[PDB]
Structure 1
Amino acid sequence: VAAERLEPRVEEKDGYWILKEQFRKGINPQEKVKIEKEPMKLFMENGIEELAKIPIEEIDQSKLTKDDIDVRLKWLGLFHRRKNQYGRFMMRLKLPNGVTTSAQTRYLASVIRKYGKEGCADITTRQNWQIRGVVLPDVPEILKGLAEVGLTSLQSGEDNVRNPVGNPLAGIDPEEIVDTRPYTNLLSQFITGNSRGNPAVSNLPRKWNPCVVGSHDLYEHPHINDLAYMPATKDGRFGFNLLVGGFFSAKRCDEAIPLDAWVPADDVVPVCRAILEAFRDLGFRGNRQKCRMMWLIDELGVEGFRAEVEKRMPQQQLERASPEDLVQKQWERRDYLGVHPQKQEGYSFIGLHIPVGRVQADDMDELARLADEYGSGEIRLTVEQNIIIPNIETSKIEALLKEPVLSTFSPDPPILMKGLVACTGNQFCGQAIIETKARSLKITEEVQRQVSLTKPVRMHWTGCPNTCAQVQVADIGFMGCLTRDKNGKTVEGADVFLGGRIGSDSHLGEVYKKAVPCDDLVPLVVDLLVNNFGAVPR
C-alpha cells in the first residue's frame, strides 16, 4: 500500500467533515447527497424546523428536499416509509445497552397512540426501540419530547455509528464479567456529542456497529460487530481486546477479526474515536456494497489498518492483544426468560417474551406500569426482541405472575417462541420481499403444535438479503424471496439457512434449501427439528 493511499480523504470545514475536492471522483450517489448538504445541519442548525412546514407533495418536487426526507433525516433517526407507508416515518433511538425507563416508555407510547392504525412500536435486533406513524409536521415537537425524557434519536441510521449493544444482564447478573452500561453509555454520548450531535463521526463511508461484551454468554454478538470490546486482563490490568470488521450484507458476511490490540478500560472512547477516524479518513466511497469497514481492513491488511488506528491514539500508543481474555469458552448460553435471582440479595429479574418484538401503545403502558409497580421503573430490551424487568423484590414475584398481561407477554412461552427473531418485513419496510412478523408467528405456532423439544432452537426470519434479522446466526434461518407454486404462480417464499452458532464457538450459517414456498415451510421445519435437533412428534 502506497503512502498516498494513507492521505486522509475528508477535512473539517465549518464544524462538519466533508470529502476533500480531489477525492470526490467516482463516489456513490449517497456521498453526493452528503456533499450537496451536510445532514447534521437538519439538527445542529435546526433545518428541521422549516423543512417540517413543507407539504410532502411539495418536498417530493425538488431533489434537495426529497433527499432531506429520504436520506438526510436518518441522521435524526427518521426513516421515510416511502413505498409502504407514504408520508410516515419510522423513528429509531440511541438506547445504549437496551436500557429504558417507564417514563420513556410512556412517552413513546403517547407518540404512537396519536397515529392510530398507522402507529405501533418494535424492539430491534440491536436491543433498541423503533416507533412508527410519525408525520413530518410533528417532528420538532417529538425531538423536544424525547430530549425532555432523556432520549436521543441522533445518528441511528445511514452512515453513522449504530446502537451500542451490551449485556442485557449488566449490573444484575451474578455471573457477569464486567457491567457494560458505563461503557455503552460513554460510547453513545461520544457518538451523539452528548445528544447535541457529533459531526466528527457522522460522515462515515457506511454504517458501523459497536458492542461491549460483559457476559460469558456473549449475548452481545461480538463476532458480527464492526468493533467489539472483549474483556481481558493484560499485565495485571483490566481492559478490552479488540475485534474489528464483523458485518452482514447481501453480498458478503464476515466475522470480526482480532485487531491484535488491547486497551485499558479508560481508553474505550479514545480507541473508538481512533478506529472511526481511520475509517472516516481512509474508507472507499464507491460501490455501496464495498464500503463497510472490513473492506478497508482487507485493502490495507489488518496490520496496515492497525497502524492507522495507532497513529490516532493519544500519545500514538496501542498495546498488542492480551493472550487470553476473560470470556470462558466453557459456557452454556443461559435462558433469560422467566424469573431469575439478581446478584443483589432479595431481588429478581423477569424476562418477558414479546412475540416478534411488536407492541401497541396500550401494551407499552402496561409494561411501564409493571416496571413501576414491581421493579425500579426500568425496562431492558434484548437483541431477541424481548424485555427484562429488573430490580423486583423477590417477595413480589407471586403477585407478578398473576398479572393478566403476562398471558400475552409470557415469562415462559413455548421453547420455539423463546428463540424466534423476525425483522420488520413488508408491513413497513420498502426493501422487504415478504411479510415476516405475522407469518413467522403463524408458522412457529403450527410447528410447535406438531413437535416437542428440549433444545432451545433459534429461528430467525428476515425479509430480504440485508439480513437485519441475522439469519446467518440462526439454528434455522428464513430469508425472504419470491418463488413459484406447483402451478407456476408467484408466491412468497424463504431460502432456508442452517449452521449458525452463537457464543464463543460462533459460526456463520449458509443456505441449505432455496426458494421454499412459505405455505410449504411447516412440514420442512417439523422434519428438520426431528431429524437435526432432537424434536419429538406429539
Structure 2
Amino acid sequence: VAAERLEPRVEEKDGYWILKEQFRKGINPQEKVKIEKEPMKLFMENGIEELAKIPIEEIDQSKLTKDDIDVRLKWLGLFHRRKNQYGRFMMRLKLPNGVTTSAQTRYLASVIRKYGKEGCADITTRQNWQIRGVVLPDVPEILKGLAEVGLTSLQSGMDNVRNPVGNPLAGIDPEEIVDTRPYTNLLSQFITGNSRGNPAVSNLPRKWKPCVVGSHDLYEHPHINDLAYMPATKDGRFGFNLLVGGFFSAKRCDEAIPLDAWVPADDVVPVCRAILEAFRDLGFRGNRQKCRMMWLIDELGVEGFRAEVEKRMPQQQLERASPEDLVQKQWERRDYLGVHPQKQEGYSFIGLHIPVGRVQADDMDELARLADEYGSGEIRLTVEQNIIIPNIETSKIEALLKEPVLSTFSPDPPILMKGLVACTGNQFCGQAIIETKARSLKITEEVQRQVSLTKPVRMHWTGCPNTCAQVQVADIGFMGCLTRDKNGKTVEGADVFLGGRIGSDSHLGEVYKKAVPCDDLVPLVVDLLVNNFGAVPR
C-alpha cells in the first residue's frame, strides 16, 4: 500500500472542500457536478433565493441549473421528482434520534396542506420526516419556516452524513443502556454546523450513515450503519466501541465490522470527524457502486483505515476496543407499540402504528394534538415508520384509547401490520420498479385475513435494488422487479427474501425466490408463514 495512497485528495479552498486537480481524473459525473459548483453555496451563499426565481422550464435548458435542481439541491434536502412528479420536490429533514414536536409536526402539515393532491408526508427508515409537493419558488420561505420551528433539512441527501439514528425509547425506558439523544443531537449539530452548514463533511465520495446505540434490543440497527456507537465500559470509563462500514447497495450488502476502537463518551464527535475526514480525504471517487466507506476499508484493511482515523484524532490516540460492550446478548427485542410504563413513575408511552409511514396534513394535526393533549408536545419517529408519544400521565390512558384517530393509527394493529415497512415506491420515486405502499398494505391485509400468528414476522417491501426499505433485515422481504404472467404479459413482481435477523444475533437475508408476480404473493406468503413461522390458518 504505497504511502502515496495516504495523501489527502481534497483541499479547503475558500471555505469549501474540493478535489485537488491531480486526483480529478476518471471521476464519476456526481464528482464533476460538485467540482463545477459547490452545493453548499446554495444555502451558505444564499443562492437558492435567486435560483428559486427561474421558471422550471428555463432551468432545464442549461446543464448548470438542471444540476442545481436535480443534484445540488439535495444538499439542501430537496429531491426533484423529475419522472413521477415533475417540478415537485420531496423534502427530507435532520431529525436526530427521530424526536419531533407538535409545532414542528403542525408546521410540516401546513406546508403539505398547501399542495393539495400533490402533498402528503412519510416517516422514513431512518426515523425521519419527508414532505412532498414542494415547489421551488416556495423553498426560500419554507427554509425560513423550518429554521423558525427549529429544524434543518441540510445535507440529508446525496454525499452527506444522513440522519443520526438513536434509541426510540431514549430517556423513557427503564431498560435503556445510555440515553442517545445528547449524542445524536451533538452529531447532527456538528454535521450541519448548528444549522448553518458544515462544508468540512459536505463533500464525501458517498453518503454516510451513523447511529448511536442505547438499547439492548438494538432498535438502532448498528450492523448496517457506516458508524455505530456501541456502549461499552473501558478502564472504568463509560464510552463507545466503534463499528464501521455497514451498508446496503444494489451491488453489495455488508455488515459493520469493529474498527477495534473505543472512545470515552466525550469523544463521540471528534471520532466522528476523524473517520469522516479520513473518508473524505482518502476516499475513492470513480464508479459509484464502489464509493461507500467499506470499499476504502477493504482497500487499506481495517488496520490501514484505523491508523488514518488515529492521526486525525485529538492527541492522536485512539484507544483499542473494550473486549465487551454494555449490550446484553440475552435479549428478546421488545414490541414498543401500545401502552408501556416509563421509568418516570405515573407516566406511560404509547406506540402507534402508521400504515406504511404515510400521513396526510389532517393526520399530522391529529397526532400533534394527541401529543399536546395527552403527552408533552413530543412525537418520536421509528425506523419501522411508526410513532411513539411519550410522557402521558397513565391516568389519561383510558380516555386516549377512545380517541377516533386511534382506529386508523392503532396501538394494537394485527401482528403483520405491526412490523410492515415499505419504501416510497413508484408513486413518487423515479428509481422504483413497482408501487410499494398501497400494494404492501393490500397484500398484508389479505394474508392476515387468512392466517393467525404469535411470532412477530417483520415484512419489508422495497421498490428497487437500492433497498431503502432494507429487505435484507426482514423475516420476509420483497424487492420490486418486473416479471411475466402465465401468458407472457409484463406484470409487477417481487423477489422474496428470507433469513434476515436483527438484534445482537443479526444476519443478512438473501433471495429465496425470484420474480414472483405480485398477484401471486398472497398464497406464497400464507404458506411461508404457516410453514416457517408457526402461523395457523383461520
- CA-atom RMSD in angstroms: 0.2
Q: Secondary structure at the match of 1:3?
A: coil
Q: Distance in 2 between matches of 1:336 and 1:496?
A: 27
Q: Deviations over 1:100-133 (max 9, x none)?
A: 0000000000000000000000000000000000
Q: Secondary structure at the match of 1:4?
A: coil
Counting only pairs closer than 5 Å after superposition, residues 66-465 of structure 1 correspond to structure 2 as 66-465=66-465
Q: Deviations over 1:345-399 (max 9, x none)?
A: 0000000000000000000000000000000000000000000000000000000
Q: Distance in 2 between matches of 1:515 and 1:235?
A: 53
Deviation at 1:279, TM superposition (A): 0.2
Q: Distance in 2 between matches of 1:393 and 1:219?
A: 25
Q: Distance in 2 between matches of 1:25 and 1:79?
A: 28
Deviation at 1:459, TM superposition (A): 0.1
Q: Deviations over 1:55-87 (max 9, x none)?
A: 000000000000000000000000000000000
Gaps of 5+ in 1: none
Q: Distance in 1 between matches of 2:437 and 2:256?
A: 29
Q: Deviations over 1:437-462 (max 9, x none)?
A: 00000000000000000000000000
Q: Distance in 1 between matches of 2:171 and 2:64?
A: 46
Deviation at 1:237, TM superposition (A): 0.4
Q: Secondary structure at the match of 2:5?
A: helix
Q: Distance in 1 between matches of 2:167 and 2:212?
A: 8
Q: Distance in 1 between matches of 2:17 and 2:151?
A: 25
Deviation at 1:242, TM superposition (A): 0.1
Q: Distance in 2 between matches of 1:61 and 1:317?
A: 52
Deviation at 1:92, TM superposition (A): 0.1
Deviation at 1:48, TM superposition (A): 0.1
Deviation at 1:490, TM superposition (A): 0.1
Deviation at 1:208, TM superposition (A): 0.3
Q: Deviations over 1:313-371 (max 9, x none)?
A: 00100000000000000000000000000000000000000000000000000000000
Q: Secondary structure at the match of 1:199?
A: coil
Deviation at 1:148, TM superposition (A): 0.2
Deviation at 1:134, TM superposition (A): 0.1
Q: Secondary structure at the match of 1:100?
A: strand
Alignment match, 2:28: 28
Q: Deviations over 1:199-234 (max 9, x none)?
A: 000000000000000000000000000000000000
Q: Distance in 2 between matches of 1:58 and 1:349?
A: 51
Q: Distance in 2 between matches of 1:387 and 1:516?
A: 32
Q: Deviations over 1:276-304 (max 9, x none)?
A: 00000000000000000000000000000
Q: Distance in 2 between matches of 1:471 and 1:517?
A: 17
Q: Secondary structure at the match of 1:5?
A: coil
Deviation at 1:515, TM superposition (A): 0.3
Alignment match, 1:492: 492
Q: Distance in 2 between matches of 1:11 and 1:218?
A: 38
Deviation at 1:40, TM superposition (A): 0.2
Q: Secondary structure at the match of 2:307?
A: helix
Q: Normalising by the residue count of structure 1, what TM-score does the alignment of the two structures yield?
A: 1.00
Q: Distance in 1 between matches of 2:381 and 2:500?
A: 23
Q: Distance in 2 between matches of 1:209 and 1:184?
A: 12
Q: Distance in 2 between matches of 1:7 and 1:26?
A: 18
Q: Secondary structure at the match of 2:111?
A: helix
Q: Distance in 2 between matches of 1:338 and 1:25?
A: 55
Q: Distance in 2 between matches of 1:344 and 1:458?
A: 30
Deviation at 1:491, TM superposition (A): 0.1
Runs ≥4 residues deviating over 2 A:
none
Gaps of 5+ in 2: none
Q: How many residues align?
A: 538
Q: Normalising by the residue count of structure 2, what TM-score does the alignment of the two structures yield?
A: 1.00
Deviation at 1:89, TM superposition (A): 0.1
Deviation at 1:98, TM superposition (A): 0.2
Q: Secondary structure at the match of 2:472?
A: helix
Q: Distance in 2 between matches of 1:113 and 1:77?
A: 19
Deviation at 1:505, TM superposition (A): 0.1
